[PDB]
Design a protein around this ligand. Structure first.
Ligand SMILES: Cc1cc2nc3c(=O)[nH]c(=O)nc-3n(C[C@H](O)[C@H](O)[C@H](O)COP(=O)(O)OP(=O)(O)OC[C@H]3O[C@@H](n4cnc5c(N)ncnc54)[C@H](O)[C@@H]3O)c2cc1C
Ligand code: HEM
Ligand SMILES: Clc1ccc(CO[C@H](Cn2ccnc2)c2ccc(Cl)cc2Cl)cc1
Length: 398
């Protein structure tokens, strides 16, 4: 696709963009977001100042630029980003805006070093990259269980731990969504479009929340941890909104189930390769959904439930989990309270799970980082390790 003249330039100018990453990406958001202010209905301003989004330009540009020789090596991450982008209603028309400001950023930072051929080459590289995304995302759009945001009604609010509530939600009249006959794969998340009233907030806020169950008869269920303030910065915007302000009976807007996180359907129906469900904190949520599937499809499979939380009180889904585990032939229930016990290490996973195992893991950015490292050392095949981070996945690879 991209030419070697214009491909050489790209390789040759990665050292500058890698070194000037933070500045460019800061310039990019400052400009783009104060020109197109409506975009603040999509981008979460807090991502830039907290998690993995200060080097995100330099994450997604260094990745591209470094892999410019062969872009297909990133295809897995593109597909995962895709689910998020479609979930978030990112459309072909958004892409040029990004590209336009990406070049404008570089020009501002590099000055006369960013020559017309340098700019040109990136302009080119960009559309090539964007074209892969638009195409991946188009297929996802035509395959979603329903188009865009649709109004749902909050039919129940229940604490399933001291600071995690579970919302059960039902589609409103004329949303055109019949609850039963919505095929959900356990491990998919939905995405909400809220508009918080606190903290001087003026725009929409979009967040993915993993479904607790693939069963839809009584509504869709998701569970939200309260990201509190404590002694430092402010509370998480939507988690506080949901917890404090979303009342049962209120409307909420959701987009269709997204995501790649799913258990291996071939290994469900056998008893030789055990299923390992490895979770921290609210991360337990898609795993609960996955557990419910295994228990219902085949309860003879060996299951290892490895749930970590701070407390018994902060331990999510105690009733729910017990009840499902009671139904299986051979389980090992492993509950880690980090107020009493050490964090999960490789040593721990060796002793507590089998050497050959079909493993699924979920929780914070940091919990993933750790778990993937541990399982790699114990030499679990990559095919056997699967994970879904509760932040940006482009920063939980390499
Ligand atoms: C695929 C996927 C599935 C997910 N599933 C779930 C789920 O089932 N349940 C769930 O609870 N979450 C889930 N998450 C995480 C969730 O979507 C949100 O990321 C989460 O609710 C936080 O949103 P927030 O608006 O409340 O916090 P934000 O306002 O987005 O801020 C995030 C964090 O930054 C901190 N912060 C705020 N300001 C600053 C600052 N200035 N400096 C440093 N730190 C700051 C806040 O305290 C907060 O902890 C999932 C995420 C993904 C990607
Ligand atoms: C080829 C160009 C693009 C690339 C490489 C890219 C890459 C990424 C990556 C890596 C993430 C993090 C998701 C995760 O880790 O799970 C992300 C999320 C996101 N993308 Fe893109 N994206 C592109 C285009 C766009 C466009 C055109 C828009 C709209 C203007 C957009 C809006 C968003 C939003 C809103 C998020 C998450 C929410 C946030 O960051 O606040 N992206 N993208
Ligand atoms: Cl080749 C390429 C172009 C754009 C992007 C990622 O686009 C991000 C914004 N973003 C983040 C999430 N969704 C969109 C971005 C563009 C430009 C700059 Cl300078 C910084 C960033 Cl962070 C990735 C590779």
């Amino acid at each position: 696709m991209l030419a070697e003249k214009t491909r050489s330039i790209i390789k040759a100018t990665v050292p500058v963009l890698e070194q000037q990453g933070t500045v460019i990406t800061r310039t990019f958001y400052k400009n783009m977001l104060t020109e197109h202010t409506e975009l603040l209905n999509i981008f979460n301003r807090t991502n830039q100042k907290v998690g993995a989004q200060p080097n995100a330009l330099a994450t997604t540009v260094l990745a591209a630029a470094k892999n410019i020789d062969d872009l297909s090596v990133l295809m897995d991450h593109v597909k995962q980003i895709g689910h998020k982008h479609r979930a978030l209603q990112i459309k072909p028309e958004h892409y040029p805006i990004v590209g336009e400001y990406l070049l404008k950023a570089i020009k501002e930072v590099l000055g006369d070093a960013a020559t017309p051929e340098i700019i040109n080459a990136w302009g080119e590289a960009y559309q090539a990259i964007a074209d892969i995304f638009i195409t991946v995302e188009k297929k996802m759009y035509e395959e979603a269980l329903w188009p865009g945001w649709k109004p749902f009604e909050i039919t129940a609010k229940e604490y399933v731990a001291s600071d995690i509530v579970e919302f059960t939600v039902k589609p409103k009249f004329g949303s055109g969504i019949e609850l039963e006959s919505l095929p959900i794969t356990p491990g998919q998340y939905i995405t909400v479009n809220t508009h918080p009233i606190r903290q001087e907030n003026q725009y929409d806020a979009l967040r993915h929340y993993s479904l607790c169950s693939a069963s839809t008869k009584n509504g869709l269920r998701f569970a939200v941890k309260m990201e509190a303030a404590r002694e430092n910065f402010p509370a998480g915007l939507v988690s506080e909104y949901l917890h404090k302000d979303a009342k049962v009976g209120d409307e909420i807007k959701l987009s269709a189930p997204a995501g790649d996180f799913a258990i291996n359907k071939e290994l469900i129906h056998q008893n030789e390769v055990p299923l390992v469900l490895l979770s921290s904190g609210v991360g337990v949520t898609p795993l609960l959904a996955m557990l419910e599937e295994q228990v219902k499809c085949n309860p003879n499979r060996p299951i290892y439930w490895i749930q970590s939380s701070y407390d018994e009180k902060t331990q999510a889904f105690k009733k729910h989990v017990d009840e499902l585990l009671a139904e299986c032939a051979n389980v090992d229930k492993i509950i880690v309270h980090t107020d009493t016990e050490p964090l999960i290490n490789a040593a721990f996973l060796k002793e507590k799970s089998p050497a050959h195992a079909d493993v699924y893991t979920c929780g914070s950015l940091a919990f993933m980082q750790a778990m993937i490292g541990h399982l790699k050392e114990l030499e679990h095949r990559d095919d056997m390790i699967h994970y879904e981070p509760f932040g940006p996945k482009m920063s939980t690879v390499q």
